[PDB]
Curated annotation (Swiss-Prot), chain A:
A motif (JAMM motif) lies at residues 86-99. CDD domains: MPN_RPN11_CSN5. The lineage of its organism: Eukaryota, Fungi, Dikarya, Ascomycota, Saccharomycotina. Keywords: Acetylation, Hydrolase, Metal-binding, Metalloprotease, Protease, Proteasome, Thiol protease, Ubl conjugation pathway, Zinc. Zn(2+) binds at H86, H88, D99. This is Ubiquitin carboxyl-terminal hydrolase RPN11. Belongs to the peptidase M67A family. It holds the Pfam family JAB.
Swiss-Prot record, chain B:
This is 26S proteasome regulatory subunit RPN8. Present with 19800 molecules/cell in log phase SD medium. Belongs to the peptidase M67A family. It comes from Saccharomyces cerevisiae (strain ATCC 204508 / S288c) (Baker's yeast). N-acetylated by NAT1. Acts as a regulatory subunit of the 26S proteasome which is involved in the ATP-dependent degradation of ubiquitinated proteins. The lineage of its organism: Eukaryota, Fungi, Dikarya, Ascomycota, Saccharomycotina.
Swiss-Prot record, chain C:
The lineage of its organism: Eukaryota, Fungi, Dikarya, Ascomycota, Saccharomycotina. The chain holds residues 378 to 482 of 523 of the full protein. This is 26S proteasome regulatory subunit RPN3. It comes from Saccharomyces cerevisiae (strain ATCC 204508 / S288c). Present with 16700 molecules/cell in log phase SD medium. The 26S proteasome is composed of a core protease, known as the 20S proteasome, capped at one or both ends by the 19S regulatory complex (RC). The RC is composed of at least 18 different subunits in two subcomplexes, the base and the lid, which form the portions proximal and distal to the 20S proteolytic core, respectively. Belongs to the proteasome subunit S3 family. N-acetylated by NAT1. The modification Phosphoserine is found at S77.
């Protein structure tokens, strides 16, 4: 039920610094605000210099930190330090015990402070691997034992999005574009489960409608819609969406190869 | 695709100076051609589905 | 005299059940379950059942045991495409027909 909302600039600065430090792990701090018990919002990030030793407690640099703080004050960015990013390149997202102790050093600052692990290399143009969570593949380290996972979402202002739109100009390329497949897996599934759901509704309307007059039936059902029209209706989206879905791939395979 | 073909002609013929920045991008176009966990049956299973 | 024709059908059933419940059976045993005299009798009767599209088997003669045909994977291949396609078309012209006789309003 608990969650964090990670603004775009945070996420991009994140992945940038991470990808830039490869193949060594980088750390930094997270600026935001705690809405309620159920939420942490992260609007900002700044990057913490390298250390001779690995990412660790003293890697956090007071001088550097406050030195950044005030200079953000002058920009009005004033926020708490709500968590700290990090990266475990190639190793997936989990906290080593050494990650843990530091996480505690951020518990005693604020009890709700969170840990964010980013994984630059295997995060790729598909799904981005990211994780945020706090203490008490990954189960080897006691995913649930010493600590526990959290959830993540992304705040987007209208204008933000509007900038992001113009990145790709798809106006020429449309029609060879194949939309995300997993999404049409939930599509082609939930659609079918639904058709099942209204099947026996159409069954009940044919039996009841059989033994009861139309004038009586209307009184009952006018509230909802004619389950025969959810068959007639719902069959379509599956039909044509799946025919363009098939054809599009049939073309990309033979044409593009 | 026409465009690029006869252009490349103009490179080996019209002697338009070699433009590397384009050739790089052509290469990058080849690097992305799908070889075709084989993707082939990865696709077949879908189309069936 | 209608009913006394069933002696064919009954035996067809006997074979079909002996098929669904066994992957492969020595002729001896089928001949026991069907009470018949001889194996030689059997493979005439079963050879008949196959031609009628009942069993979908083959027969191993030298060892004398029926073997029933399997499903042989192949899903990852394109055969489901062809099959589904035939079924699809044959669904279409059902839809068609039901709209051609529909004209009357
Ligand atoms: Zn770490």
């Amino acid at each position: 039920k608990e969650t964090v909302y990670i603004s775009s600039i945070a996420l991009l600065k994140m992945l940038k610094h991470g990808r830039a430090g490869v193949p060594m792990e980088v750390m930094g701090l997270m600026l935001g605000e705690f809405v309620d018990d159920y939420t942490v919002n992260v609007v900002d990030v700044f990057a913490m210099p390298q250390s001779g030793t690995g990412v660790s407690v003293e890697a956090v640099d007071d001088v550097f930190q406050a030195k950044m703080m005030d200079m953000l004050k002058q920009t009005g960015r004033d926020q708490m330090v709500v968590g700290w990013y990090h990266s475990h390149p190639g190793f997936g997202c989990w906290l080593s015990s050494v990650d843990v102790n530091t996480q505690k050093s951020f518990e005693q600052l604020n009890s709700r402070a969170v840990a964010v692990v980013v994984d630059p290399i295997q995060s790729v143009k598909g799904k981005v691997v990211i994780d945020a969570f706090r203490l008490i593949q990954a189960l080897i380290h006691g995913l649930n034992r010493h600590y526990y996972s959290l959830n993540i979402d992304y705040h987007k202002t209208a204008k933000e999005t509007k900038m992001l739109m113009n990145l790709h100009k798809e106006q020429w390329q449309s029609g060879l574009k194949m939309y995300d497949y997993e999404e049409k897996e939930e599509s082609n599934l939930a659609a079918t489960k639904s058709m099942v759901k209204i099947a026996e509704q159409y069954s009940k309307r044919i039996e009841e409608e059989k033994e009861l007059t139309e004038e009586e039936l209307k009184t009952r059902y006018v509230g909802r819609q004619d389950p025969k029209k959810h068959l007639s209706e719902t069959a379509d989206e599956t039909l044509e969406n799946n025919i363009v879905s098939v054809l599009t791939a049939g073309v990309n395979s033979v044409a593009i190869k | 695709l026409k465009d690029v073909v006869e252009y490349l002609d103009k490179v080996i013929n019209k002697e338009l100076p070699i433009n590397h920045t384009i050739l790089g991008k052509l290469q990058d176009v080849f690097n992305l051609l799908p070889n075709l966990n084989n993707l082939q049956k990865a696709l077949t299973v879908k189309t069936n589905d | 005299q209608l009913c006394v024709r069933l002696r064919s059908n009954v035996i067809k059933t006997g074979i079909r059940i002996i098929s669904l419940t066994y992957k492969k059976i020595s002729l001896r045993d089928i001949c026991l379950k069907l009470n018949l005299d001889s194996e030689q009798t059997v493979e005439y009767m079963v050879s008949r059942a196959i031609r009628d599209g009942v069993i979908e088997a083959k027969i191993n003669h030298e060892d004398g045991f029926i073997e029933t045909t399997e499903l042989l994977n192949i899903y990852d291949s394109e055969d489901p495409q062809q099959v589904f396609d035939e079924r699809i078309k044959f669904a279409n012209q059902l839809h068609d027909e039901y709209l051609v006789s529909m004209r009357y309003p």
